[PDB]
Every structure is written in structure tokens, then in C-alpha cells.
Design an enzyme around this catalytic site. Structure first.
Site, short mmCIF file in Angstrom:
data_model
loop_
_atom_site.label_atom_id
_atom_site.label_comp_id
_atom_site.label_asym_id
_atom_site.label_seq_id
_atom_site.Cartn_x
_atom_site.Cartn_y
_atom_site.Cartn_z
N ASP A 146 0.78 -1.24 0.00
CA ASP A 146 0.00 0.00 0.00
C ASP A 146 0.81 1.28 0.00
O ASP A 146 1.37 1.68 1.02
CB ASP A 146 -0.88 -0.04 1.25
CG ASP A 146 -1.89 1.07 1.31
OD1 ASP A 146 -1.88 1.94 0.42
OD2 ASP A 146 -2.70 1.04 2.27
N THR A 147 0.88 1.98 -1.13
CA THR A 147 1.63 3.23 -1.20
C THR A 147 0.96 4.38 -0.44
O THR A 147 1.64 5.37 -0.17
CB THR A 147 1.82 3.69 -2.66
OG1 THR A 147 0.56 3.75 -3.33
CG2 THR A 147 2.69 2.67 -3.38
N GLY A 148 -0.31 4.25 -0.09
CA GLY A 148 -1.03 5.25 0.68
C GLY A 148 -0.92 5.09 2.17
O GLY A 148 -1.57 5.78 2.96
#
Ligand code: 3TL
Ligand code: 3TL
Lengths: 99, 99
Positions: free
Chosen positions: B25-27
Site C-alpha cells: 500500500d503506497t497510501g
């Protein structure tokens, strides 16, 4: 381009004449923007994450320019504290994870 | 490898002798795992997202194998409905966004 992840992957978006910054988020199924003025009809929907669920408005066929690249897709609008570009639109700009 | 995003970027992790699947998850600033048995001391913390905030436990210097690659870092444990690998560890395996 190549985005390393020491910082939040934030980029410039253009939507309905307005310039905003949005997070490129591989953990989001959908695209959800802070409250903003969006034309057309819209269906009521629910999204969930850590801590709970929220009520958003869903708009279909919204034009959006994510850092230079045009995409057209479903956009949700709601009480998010940050603008989030989700996988539905990251695929239209051919975005991939690499390691 | 290269992960396109038509599906949830789920991968195999190994943590404290257990095999699990986690979302890349880049967020997410941090790494947060569903409740599991983790040794050592742990500090109390708060994380927020859409819909609210949650109480997690934070563990430092946890060994973790994300799809073959070893990393050592801070891991949070809490009431998340999905295992999430966050940017703190995605950088240790040199993970990047490309488009
Ligand atoms: C930004 C949100 C749209 C995002 N939520 C989602 O994408 C999740 C899967 N929800 C979701 O997709 O909503 C559609 C839905 C609605 C009703 C029932 C089932 C599914 C999110 O909070 N994503 C976070 C990770 C996460 C995922 C699941 C739950 C908790 C945290 C950071 O990547
Ligand atoms: C999985 C969570 C750790 C993640 N939350 C975060 O990473 C956010 C920034 N919170 C966070 O980093 O917590 C540290 C903190 C605590 C107190 C005050 C300020 C900061 C998340 O829900 N991320 C989602 C996007 C998002 C981000 C911010 C808010 C709402 C949704 C999907 O990518």
C-alpha cells in the site's frame, strides 16, 4: 516516471478546471476526492477503511489529468482528509509497482 | 517484479513463523497487521484513515519477509480488516511506483 517512496507519492491532478494534489494509492480500490463542485447526476455510496466507513457521492465519466496523463473514470467525493487516486484510475495510466 | 494493478497488490509475507497475505500500500505511512502474537515490549499508538482512528500496538525491529525480501522495521498490530505493508517497509525492499 519512477516514484520512490521515502515521501508520500503526491502528484498534481487537474479536475473540473481545478488544480489539486492527490496521493497515488495502491491500497485504494476507488478514487476519492475531498468535497468539490462536480457537475452531473450522482449515486450515493459507502466506502470503508481503517476506523470506519463514510458516505461519498459517486460520479461516472469524470475527466481527470493525473500528472500529464488523461484518464476518464468513476470518482468519489466525500469527507476524506486527503485526495486519493485509486486503482481504478492507476490502471488507466499504466501505473505499476516495481521491486 | 512488476505488479500491475487490475487486482489488489497482495503478496505473501512471513512474520514470526507465520505465513500471511498482505496488501502493498503506497497510501500507508506505516505497516499495520491484523491481531497476531508478537513478542517483546510495545508502545501504544493511534492511526487514522477514512472513517476514523484506531488503537494499535507498535513493535520495533520486527523481522519480516515480504515476498522473498527480508526487511526489519516498525510493525503495528490492530483491528485492521486487512494486512497492510506501508511505505516504511516498501522503501527497504526498494519498491517504486512507475508510469
Ligand atoms: C481510500 C479507501 C477507498 C480505501 N478503502 C478501500 O479501498 C476498501 C477496500 N473499501 C472499499 O473498497 O469500499 C468498497 C466496498 C463497500 C462496501 C463493502 C465492500 C466494499 C482505504 O482506506 N485504503 C487503505 C487500506 C485499507 C483497506 C481496507 C480496509 C482498511 C484499510 C489505505 O490504502
Ligand atoms: C492504513 C493506514 C495506516 C493509512 N493511514 C495513514 O497512513 C494516515 C496518514 N495516518 C497516519 O499516518 O497515522 C499517523 C498519525 C497519527 C496521528 C496524527 C497524525 C498522523 C490509511 O488509511 N491509508 C489510506 C489512505 C488515507 C490516508 C489518510 C487518511 C485517509 C485515508 C489508504 O492508502
Amino acid at each position: 516516471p519512477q516514484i520512490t517512496l521515502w515521501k508520500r507519492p503526491l502528484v498534481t491532478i487537474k479536475i473540473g478546471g481545478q488544480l489539486k494534489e492527490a496521493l497515488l494509492d495502491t491500497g485504494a480500490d476507488d478514487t476519492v476526492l475531498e468535497e468539490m463542485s462536480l457537475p452531473g447526476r450522482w449515486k450515493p455510496k459507502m466506502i470503508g477503511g481503517i476506523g470506519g466507513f463514510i458516505k461519498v457521492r459517486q460520479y461516472d465519466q469524470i475527466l481527470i489529468e493525473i500528472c500529464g496523463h488523461k484518464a476518464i473514470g468513476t470518482v468519489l467525493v466525500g469527507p476524506t482528509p486527503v485526495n486519493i487516486i485509486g486503482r481504478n484510475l492507476l490502471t488507466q495510466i499504466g501505473c505499476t509497482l516495481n521491486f
